[PDB]
Amino acid sequence: QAPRALPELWAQPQRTLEARVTYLAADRYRRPPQVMMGGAAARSGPNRSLALLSELEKRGDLHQLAVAYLATGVPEPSSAKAILEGMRSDLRWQSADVLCDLGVAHYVASKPLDAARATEELREALRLFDTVLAMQPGHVQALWNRSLVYRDLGLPLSAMKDLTEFEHRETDEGWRSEARDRRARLSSTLRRKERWLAADQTGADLINRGAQELARALTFVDVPLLRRDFYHAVRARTSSTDVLALLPLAERLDASVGSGTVLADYVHQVAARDFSRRAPLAEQYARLISGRIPESEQDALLQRFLTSDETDLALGALAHVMQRLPAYASELVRRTQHDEDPWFRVLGLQAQAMLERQQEHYKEALAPLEQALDICRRERLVYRCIFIENDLSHVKSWLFRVNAAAQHARDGLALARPNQWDLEGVMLQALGNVARQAADVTLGRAYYGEALLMAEGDKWSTRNIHQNLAHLAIWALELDEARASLDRAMDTGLPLTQHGVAALVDVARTRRSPRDALMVEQALAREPGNTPGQRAYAKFLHGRILVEVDPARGRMLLDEAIRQAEALPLDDVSAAHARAYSYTSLIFADADTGDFIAALARFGAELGFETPARCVLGLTADTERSLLVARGAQGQLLSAYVPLRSSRFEAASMEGAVPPEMLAALQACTLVDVLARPPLQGRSGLLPPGIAWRYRTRAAAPPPPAGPGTHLVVNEVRYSEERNEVPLQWLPRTAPGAEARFLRDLAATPTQVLEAISTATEIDLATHGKVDPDSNFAYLLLAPGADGRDTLFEDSIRASQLTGAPLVVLAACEGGRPNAALHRAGSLPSAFLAAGARAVLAATHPIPDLDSSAFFGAVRDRVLAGASLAVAVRDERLQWLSAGGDSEWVNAVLVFE
Amino acid sequence: QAPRALPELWAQPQRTLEARVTYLAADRYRRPPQVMMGGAAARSGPNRSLALLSELEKRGDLHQLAVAYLATGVPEPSSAKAILEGMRSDLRWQSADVLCDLGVAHYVASKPLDAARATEELREALRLFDTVLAMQPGHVQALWNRSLVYRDLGLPLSAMKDLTEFEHRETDEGWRSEARDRRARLSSTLRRKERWLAADQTGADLINRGAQELARALTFVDVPLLRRDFYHAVRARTSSTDVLALLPLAERLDASVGSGTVLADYVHQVAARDFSRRAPLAEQYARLISGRIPESEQDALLQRFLTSDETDLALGALAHVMQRLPAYASELVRRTQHDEDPWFRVLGLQAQAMLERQQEHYKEALAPLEQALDICRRERLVYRCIFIENDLSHVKSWLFRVNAAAQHARDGLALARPNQWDLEGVMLQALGNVARQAADVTLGRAYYGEALLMAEGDKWSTRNIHQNLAHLAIWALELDEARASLDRAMDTGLPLTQHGVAALVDVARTRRSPRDALMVEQALAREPGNTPGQRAYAKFLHGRILVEVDPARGRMLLDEAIRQAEALPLDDVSAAHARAYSYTSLIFADADTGDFIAALARFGAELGFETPARCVLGLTADTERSLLVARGAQGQLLSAYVPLRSSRFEAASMEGAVPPEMLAALQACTLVDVLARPPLQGRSGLLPPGIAWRYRTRAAAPPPPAGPGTHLVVNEVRYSEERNEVPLQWLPRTAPGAEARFLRDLAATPTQVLEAISTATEIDLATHGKVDPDSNFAYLLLAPGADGRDTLFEDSIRASQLTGAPLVVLAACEGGRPNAALHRAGSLPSAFLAAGARAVLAATHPIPDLDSSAFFGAVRDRVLAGASLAVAVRDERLQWLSAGGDSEWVNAVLVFE
């Protein structure tokens, strides 16, 4: 039967859902649903008759079935999601319509949710609508629904933009009228922008005209920037009478903040000082604040300020000049350590934090920020507080504490939203940066587009936003969009920073522009790098851009960058990044030239040992280039270079990465050493189960211990009430004449396990190894202790030293690659191997009905016989699969050595 | 065809939902579902085939159809809810199984929604499971599901109790094993109790022994009570060296709170005083804290502390003693008004709020509480801030701001959960109190039962919890449970309080016990009352308990309570309660003995006028009794006394309350004056549309004005953007030679309307009258003013004085009728009548598309003709019903006079 429309479902005169579905019968102008706060109305007509839906499904009208699950009766987005995911792989429906309906289902599911959980559904819906409008720019339903999604995310300007484009593209008069009404309602946002602009102009006029602008100024007391403008206005007066004329404003905006007074006292203090010395300095300070003073004269003017008795003018000059010349931040820090005004104490703590960050000491930059935030919350002065929250979010994001960074960004945005416009745009930029750190392209792009709409006219925020958008495009491999956004960033008349330089050197390889090299030269000249690690990173950036045009000079620059990075401690983040990225660039430059022996040489050299002559596999991927080079048993060399990729390695299973010829060559090897450079380390499914292999990461394992050891089993752990994990059981296979030190139930605390692992020569951690959602640090889940903690983070394991060189077995492990990170491989197996373990093999799947004990006991017996670990695990894998055992779990058991 | 199960639906080896459904084929042990956070896995093989569901519906297997909607595939709780609500009225299915399945559907529907909306669904599921276990105590599925519901509400101990009973009652081995595993996982919340007990003992040891326990006490820095215990320990040291020895703990637990040091400084101060005089006082303070000092001895030591040079000791002693002697709270507030330590500032604000509360100034007690909440949140001290949240919740609940009170209780519970045990039990008691105030029996009982399980051994919290449970049982008309819980409260050995005495006088009327009278006498001797209103209330309670046994003395006591209450301002809450409740008790004591003339005499005398001698109806209902007494046209007296009720007057439409005999007697009256005592005032549907009736609340209407009036109309109001209300249009019928003052669009500002109504002799308010969800005050929704306020609350209207004595017409009036408020009627018509309006007729239903204008204009014309308001409205109602007009809305027009 033909799939005709069923009038009973779509007979009502009022729509049931705000979103637009793509079905023709359900997409015709019906007046919008009544907006309620507390409960919906009788959304149903014929609600959903099981006979009705059964007729629809039997006839084959799957699209109308999903649209009926969404747009009539009480919405059931999960059933519609199931049906639309089913239809996704069908050719009877337009893919744009199916993806739009799936996005509508995701959006509908988001409304009942709470913000933390509704954000995920909004992200999914936004991704679907972005796909729809990418493969059909004039999709009216996608524009409507994306405007709704943007409005729900808190981005009114993007919603208004979508509604404007919709009015451009729509033809129905009723839909266009409703879109006009919605855009007019959303345009109440611009009132805040106009009020902020009025407050800005009032503050500037107050600065330039003393108390003549007072009568207007008292009306903007609630706007945070007026305190800063009042400071600048007081510091700029050339007479005592004018300073006294600002006392009413000081008292008014001081009593609004709190009961105590710290500003009228300041006006009295400034008035008492003899103005015969102050007036020629006050005028110069006003000129400096207004920016008329040339850059060369600023140093001399600042010195003249510093060599007087007026500390407030020096404070103002230091605040205004510290950005260009961070050497003046130290003086600002020193001059306001014990300031009576909390505003300047917060400013000095912010300067301390910035000075700490400039040395890559982000970990030590948190305490001044926390103290300044406390002084904030106590004193109730919003302007400095938004900046403190922004700096805290940046610091935590750089430390990969994306949850806390996002929380700080949200707090700053909530602080800035009612009255501050530029500062809430800055907080949206902070949210976009946090999203970029977590590799969230859709949400990061949404936040950065909203901040770009808010920052129109500004030539600095525009450049920063476009640089970050280029980075987001690079991550998603839209290199054309990365090129376009970098061009937009450079078209503001400002030079790129090291962020833009990184994006450009990543993009200039395939889409070079005539001005790229000169811009990189200028930007690296202006930002050479404070620390030796930053200097090595800048050297790497220059080498990376030059390696595609002048291979000799680029190779020399990358080699000297590696040399510089090799002389610094491994805790140096910039040095490690410079070294790893220089090695990757050298490897891919050798691969491009056709020299694949050099690539394997670099593979070996990076880890500190010459690569094996046979039975070795090395793989890498940087942005859009993937290299797999290997040597067979006979020593023949085969390579698989993909110069122009299309999608980054994903799915946590790299099936099909190795070409069949390389597979055939490798199948003739006793065991294969895989030298997987990050982020391709720890992945499973790289080789078929018939091949014995191992992840090699060290030149040689620590020597085996002397004397019988003490086998350790951490099983049947009693987890806390919130963990909601099932305890696992283990039957050890202790070596002949050994001991079985059991840590079971409440005894398996982090402290007891930490002290136990330092002595055991055989460790079988039958616990769950997880990665912290916030800190992105892998930890072992154990029983709660005296402190209440129930975790053993990998940092403690790395610090701890295992004397017995144990062969650690990790069941139910979430380690290796899985989390999206190229900076550093934070994994439990790597931590255990570094701590002193001779070999680690970890299963990366939930345990298969307590049979992990038998599998790993058989492996332990096999290695006790004399077989190597790789061949032993291969034999156990083959016997497991041939005996009807589960395949997904056994194929996920990885061997590290 | 017989309803046979479908094997395909239940053939999966893994269960889909944690809950247990009652269908036999779907209730057999399948291993529990995998716990996924973020996305549901493949819950079924193909997903529910709609053809098989339609087959099930055709064959009549409705139970399996609902169970399939819930327990296989993607859950659709709405369809299952519809099917089970259909099956409720069918005798083919067991009622217990149907209600258990409906509760499971509500529980499943609660998983998507956020906490605020998931709480409603969990309440519905909990109510259904409570019903099932009330009519079938051994229902294993209900026990399992109620354990799940308790776990989801954050009540682990109740969940463990339910699982224990389940394991006592279940026979299947797999289900018993899974219940054992779930209870073992839940029993981890007792580790928190053990750690809190350890922290309490460590703090007591630190107080009693000094720094000898510092090594142990350093591990409990995160537990909130340690700061209070540290203060006590520092104050309890008799030597300077011992005081100095506590500095490590001070610095450690002070750095955790924040950067600033306020406890190291305290240690330094206590380390410099002359200990030759401090030592005896330090010892005395230690004894006072330990409680060894008798009550008759505490006053002398407190005076000694107050007269000494030591102020911290005085603060500690005053805080210890102020509970039993509230007269010392003023001294504490005075001595800590400007304290440097935020802890003692919050303590002083709390004591000030308590002093305000003790005089029934609950509104005036919010400012110190809000200030203390601000301080506790800013300075990050948790112990004091939990108490501040508890006091705020109590104060807001007393003012019937149940939403804010619930929010404060939730915040305090979240603060007190991880480490504090007794304080989190107190917060659970606060949540139960907020639920009790909102007439929420199920959630109140859940919270109070959890708080009772947590407070085992305590004899104070146990008594308070049992008194509140008695009140909750009284509200739900389970007088058996109220009696049992009052007996349980008295069995602890402590005397009842005025709360328990109120519950007892409500219970002892029908289930008197030998010790009730003596218990009431003792409790009212311990708490006679501070304010005169509280003394009047205590007199009322004594009279109400003594009126059933000794009618003469009880009647005298009730009359004296009314006399005392009538000498106090009408704003006195306790005096108003005493007067109203004493009048209700007198009415029902006269109706108890058959004297129904005295009942109507009291009906008249309560409002200040002699009751009408004919065509009058009066109705009341207190707990389980309901009296309807009326007089016919001939003056004959009829009565409908229900000595034992089973359900309170609900559904907001009192149909069937008037027996047919009394209805027939009243049908022969020109108009019926209804004297409905609260909470029965303002209810619609009391009498059929054929009877002309009105609500008489005054002795006589205000006199009419002289000269033509200014007919004021407020129509087509331009509400703000976020109100989302449809403006209403009005066509007035201004009296001959009467002005038509219009207030339209933005001219209908609350100030403008308040000014206008004070002179108009005819008012037609064509706006929306709603009750605030937060404060429960009825207000008029008007256009936004200069200040942004778009509300005219009933307090402003009552305060105003209407000089023209208008006939106010109030279309779209909501609230007052459905609310469960017996304390006082907060309603717009009452406010307008008290302001001076001669008559108010308000529609209590949404207006039917500007036909209300025609209705009320015809009513105004009819009353202008000469007929009274009641008969005119009756005639126009009859014409409206005979012309095909809507009956539901026309029946909702009530006439107040």
CB atoms closer than 10 angstroms to residue B13: 6
Residue keyed to tokens 């089993």:
A713
What's B717's DSSP letter?
Answer: B
User: Which residues pair with residue B717 across a beta bridge?
Assistant: B745
Nearest to A895 by CA among A851, A856, A843, A846: A843
- How far is B793 from B753, CA to CA, in rounded Å? 12
Q: Is B727:B716 a contact under the CB 8 Å cutoff?
A: yes
Could you tell me which residues come within 8 angstroms of residue B298 by beta carbon, excluding any fewer than 6 positions away?
B288, B321
CB contact at 8 A, B383 and B225: yes
At position A233, the amino acid (one-letter code) is A
Q: Which residue has the tokens 């410099």?
A: B272
Point out which residues pair with A763 in neighbouring strands.
A712
Place of tokens 């559907």: B105
Cα three-residue angle A323-A328-A332, rounded to 5 degrees: 100
Best probe of the B interface among A195, A375, A411, A721, by most B CBs < 10 A, is A721
Residues in chain A within 8 Å Cβ distance of B724: 34-35
CA distance A387 to A381: 11
Q: Which residues pair with B770 in a beta bridge?
A: B779
Chain A interface includes B323 (CB < 8 A): no
Give the gap in angstroms from C-alpha B840 to the nearest C-alpha of chain A: 29
Report CB contact under 8 Å: A57, B47: no
Amino acid letter, B684: S
Work out the angle at residue B867's Cα, subtended by the Cα atoms of residues B863 and B868, and round it to the nearest 5 degrees. Answer: 80
Give the strands of the sheet with B762-765, arranged side by side.
Answer: B637-642, B626-631, B616-621, B672-676, B693-695, B893-896, B839-843, B807-810, B762-765, B710-714, B739-742
Give the distance from CA A486 to its chain's centroid: 20
CA distance A569 to A549: 32
Q: Using alpha carbons, select from B802, B796, B760, B766 the residue that is nearest to residue B781.
A: B766
How far apart CA B503 and CA B486 sit, in angstroms, is: 8
Helix (H) or strand (E) holding A632: none
Of residues B51, B117, B156, nearest to A54 (C-beta): B51
Taking the CA atoms of A849, A852, A853 and A858 in sequence, report the sign of the dihedral they define. Answer: positive
Say if the Cβ atoms of A120 and B79 lie within 8 Å: no
Alpha-carbon gap, residue B379 to B340, rounded angstroms: 12
Count, residues in chain B:
897
The C-alpha angle with vertex B176 and arms to B170 and B178, in degrees rounded to 5, equals 140
Decide if A797 contacts A832 (C-beta within 8 A): yes
Angle at B575 between CA B573 and CA B576, to 5 degrees: 65
First to last CA, chain A: 63
DSSP B813: B
Beta-bridge mates of residue A638: A630
Q: In sequence order, what are the residues at sequence separation of 6 or more whose Cβ sits closer than 8 angstroms to the Cβ of residue A497? A: A464, A467, A523, A527
What DSSP string describes A706-743? Answer: SS--EEEEEEEE---TTT----------PPTT-EEEEE
Name the amino acid, one letter, at B159.
Answer: A
Q: Distance from CA of residue A852 to its chain's centroid?
A: 35
Of all residues in chain A, the one with the smallest CA distance to B53 is A50
Using a CB-CB cut-off of 8 Å, the residues of chain A touching B38 are 120
Backbone angles phi, psi at A709, to 5 degrees: -95, -165
Q: Distance (Å) from the C-alpha of residue B114 to the closest C-alpha of chain A? A: 5
Half-sphere exposure of B800 (CA within 13 A, CB side): 25
Distance from A114 to chain B by nearest Cα, in Å? 5
DSSP state at residue B705: P
Helix axes B422-437, B460-475, angle to 10 degrees: 20
Q: Which two tokens stand for residue A730?
A: 């283990």
Residue B96 near residue B38 (C-beta atoms within 8 A): no
Q: Residue B755 CA to chain centroid, in angstroms?
A: 35
Contact (CB<8Å) A374/B185: no
Chain A nearest-CA distance from B721, in A, is 8
Closest CA to A714 of A638, A776, A790, A657: A790
CA distance, residue A63 to nearest chain B CA (Å): 15
Q: Which helix (H) or strand (E) holds A629?
A: strand A626-631
User: For B186, which of A38, A82, A721 is closest by C-beta distance?
Assistant: A721
Q: What is the 3-state secondary structure (H, E, C) of B412-439?
A: HHHHHCCCCCHHHHHHHHHHHHHHHHCC
Whether the Cβ atoms of residue B277 and residue B305 lie closer than 8 Å to each other: no
d(CA B8, CA A848): 25
Cβ atoms within 10 Å of B116's Cβ, excluding its own: 12
CA B749 to chain centre: 33
Distance from the Cα of B209 to chain A's closest Cα (Å) equals 23
Q: What is the 3-state secondary structure (H, E, C) of A422-486?
A: HHHHHHHHHHHHHHHHCCCHHHHHHHHHHHHHHCCCCCCHHHHHHHHHHHHHHHCCCHHHHHHHH
The CA distance from A111 to A37, in Å, is 12
Sign of CA dihedral A68, A69, A74, A77: negative
Obtained via which technique? cryo-EM
Peptide bond into B3 cis (omega under 30): no
Q: Chain B, 102-131: which have a CB under 8 Å from a chain A CB?
A: 112-115, 117
Sequence length of chain A is 897
In this structure, is the dihedral angle defined by the CA atoms of residues A487, A492, A494 and A499, taken in order, positive or negative?
Answer: negative
CA dist., res. A254 & res. A256, Å (int): 5
Q: Let me know: does A814 contact A807? Beta carbons within 8 Å.
A: no
Closest CA to B417 of B406, B426, B408, B407: B426
Q: Count CB neighbours of B636 within 10 A.
A: 10
Taking the CA of residue A429 as centre, how many other CA atoms within 13 Å lie in the half-sphere pointing to its CB? 25
CA dist A509 and A585 (Å) reads 11
- Euclidean distance between CA atoms A362 and A349, whole angstroms: 14
Please state, in angstroms and as integers, the Cα–Cα distance from residue A526 to each residue in A501, A530, A538, B715, following that order: 12, 11, 11, 67
Residue contact B51–A51, C-beta within 8 A: no
Residue A239, Cβ density class (10 Å: 0-12 exposed, 13-18 middle, ≥19 buried): middle
Interface of B with A in 256-275 (CB under 8 A): 258-260
- Alpha carbons A839 and A830: distance in angstroms, whole number: 10
Is residue A30 within 8 Å of A21, Cβ to Cβ? no
First to last CA, chain B: 64
Residues of chain A in contact with residue B47, where contact means CB-CB under 8 angstroms, are 82
Exposed e or buried b per residue across A478-490, where buried means at least 16 C-beta atoms within 10 angstroms of its C-beta: bbebbbbbbebbb
Distance of CA A169 to the CA centre of its chain: 35
Beta bridge partners of A711: A740, A762
| Cα distance between residue A314 and residue A322, in whole Å | 12
Searching chain A, which residue's CA lies closest to the CA of residue B376? A378
CA–CA dist B703, B805 (Å, integer): 7
H or E segment and range at residue B446: helix B441-454
Q: At A638, which helix (H) or strand (E)?
A: strand A637-642
Chain centroid to CA B526: how far? 27
Please report where in the chains the tokens 């008559």 appear, as a residue. Answer: B839
Q: How far is CA A875 from CA A683, B236, B815, in A?
A: 20, 71, 77
Contact call for residues B603 and B611 (beta carbons, < 8 A)? yes
B36 touches chain A (CB under 8 A): no
Tell me if A74 and B78 make a contact (CB, 8 A cut-off): yes
3-state class (DSSP) for residue A404: helix
Is A724 close to B57, i.e. CB distance below 8 A?
Answer: no
SS (H, E, C) A786-839: CCCCCEEEHHHHHHCCCCCCCEEEECCECCCCCCCCCCCCCCHHHHHHHHCCCE
Q: Which domains does chain B have, with CATH numbers?
A: 50-153 (1.25.40), 710-896 (3.40.50.1460)
Q: Is A114 helix (H, G, I), strand (E, B) or coil?
A: coil
Residue B291: how many other CB atoms lie within 10 Å? 10
Instruction: Decide if A751 touches B, using CB distance below 8 A.
Output: no
Q: Sheet holding B791-793: strands in order across?
A: B768-771, B778-781, B791-793
Taking the Cβ of residue B35 and every Cβ of chain A, the question of whether any pair is shorter than 8 Å is answered with yes
Q: Is B770 helix (H, G, I), strand (E, B) or coil?
A: strand
Show residues of chain A in contact with B79, CB under 8 Å: 48, 50
Phi–psi pair at A694, nearest 5 degrees:
-160, 145
Where would I find the H helices in A88-172? 95-110, 115-135, 140-153, 156-169
User: Distance (Å, rounded) from C-alpha B664 to C-alpha A473?
Assistant: 82
* Beta carbons of B88 and B102 less than 8 angstroms apart: yes
Question: Comparing C-alpha atoms, which of B730, B808, B798, B728 is closest to residue B762?
Answer: B808
Ranges of H-type helices in B75-171: 77-88, 95-109, 115-135, 140-152, 156-169
CB–CB of A730/A708 below 8 Å?
A: no
Rounded Cα distance between A55 and A2, Å, is 12
CA distance B127 to chain A (A): 20
Q: Does B879 contact chain A (CB < 8 Å)?
A: no
Backbone angles phi and psi of A391, in degrees to 5: -65, -40
Bridge partners of A762?
Answer: A711
Which residue of B85, B191, B723 is the best one to mutate when testing the A interface, meaning the one whose CB has the most A CBs within 10 A? B191
Residues 6+ apart with CB under 8 A from A303: none
Structure tokens at B888: 């539901």
Rounded to whole angstroms, the Cα distance separating A626 from A662 reads 15
Residue B216 CA to residue B210 CA, distance in Å, equals: 12
Please report, as a single letter, which amino acid is at residue B123.
R
Residue with tokens 């590696």: A562
Is some CB atom of chain A closer than 8 A to the CB atom of B190?
Answer: no
Nearest-by-CA chain A residue for B112: A113
Paired strand residues for B14: B31
Q: Tell me if residue B676 falls in helix, strand or coil.
A: strand
Closest by CA to A181, choosing from A147, A152, A154, A141, is: A147
Sheet with A839-843, edge to edge strand ranges: A637-642, A626-631, A616-621, A672-676, A693-695, A893-896, A839-843, A807-810, A762-765, A710-717, A739-745
Sign of CA dihedral A127, A131, A137, A143: negative
Residues of A in contact with B111 (CB under 8 A): none
User: What would the two tokens of residue B869 be?
Assistant: 């308001």
**What distance in Å separates the CA atoms of residue B53 and residue B56, rounded to the nearest whole number?**
5
Distance between CA atoms of B569 and A476, rounded to whole angstroms?
73
User: Please, which residues bridge with residue B879 across strands?
Assistant: none
Rounded CA separation B66/B78 (Å): 10
Compute the count of residue pairs across chains A and B with CB atoms less than 8 Å apart. 77
Helix A225-234 and helix A189-209, axial crossing angle in degrees, nearest 10: 10
Residue type, A445: R
Question: Can you tell me the distance from the alpha carbon of B782 to that of B756, in angstroms, rounded to the nearest whole number?
Answer: 13
| CB contact at 8 A, B193 and B187 | no
CB A482 within 8 A of CB A470: yes
Closest CA to A569 of A519, A517, A518, A531: A531
Nearest CA in chain A to B36: A724
How does strand B616-621 pair with strand B672-676?
parallel
| Residue in B74, B78, B112 closest to A112 by CB | B112
Quote the distance between the C-alpha of residue A533 and its chain's center. Answer: 22
* Cβ contact B219–A786 (<8 Å): yes
Quoted resolution (Å): 3.1
Residues in a beta bridge with A631: A616, A637
What is the DSSP track for B455-478? TTT-SHHHHHHHHHHHHHHHHTT-
Q: Which of B36, B188, B195, B768 to mutate to test the interface with A (most CBs of A within 10 A)?
A: B188
**Consecutive H or E run containing A627:** strand A626-631
- C-alpha A853/C-alpha B433 separation (Å) is 52
B191, two tokens: 């580790």
Residue B697 tokens, joined: 């609340």
Q: Spell out which residues of chain A touch residue B113, defining contact as CB-CB under 8 Å.
A: 112-113
- The number of beta carbons lying within 10 Å of the beta carbon of residue A140 is 23
Residue B514 sits at φ, ψ, to 5 deg, of -60, -35
Three state DSSP letters for A223-264: CCHHHHHHHHHHCCCCCHHHHHCCHHHHHHHHHCCCCCCCCH
Cis status of the peptide bond prior to A689, with omega within 30 of 0: no
By CB atoms closer than 10 A (0-12, 13-18, 19+), residue A761 is buried
The residue of A16, A34, A54, A720 whose CB has the most chain B CBs within 10 angstroms, and thus the best one to mutate to test that interface, is A54
Query: At A793, which amino acid appears?
Result: F
Which of A79, A257, A751 has the highest number of chain B CBs within 10 A, making it the mutation to test binding with B?
A: A79
Set of chain A residues whose Cβ sits within 8 Å of the Cβ of B112: 109, 112-113
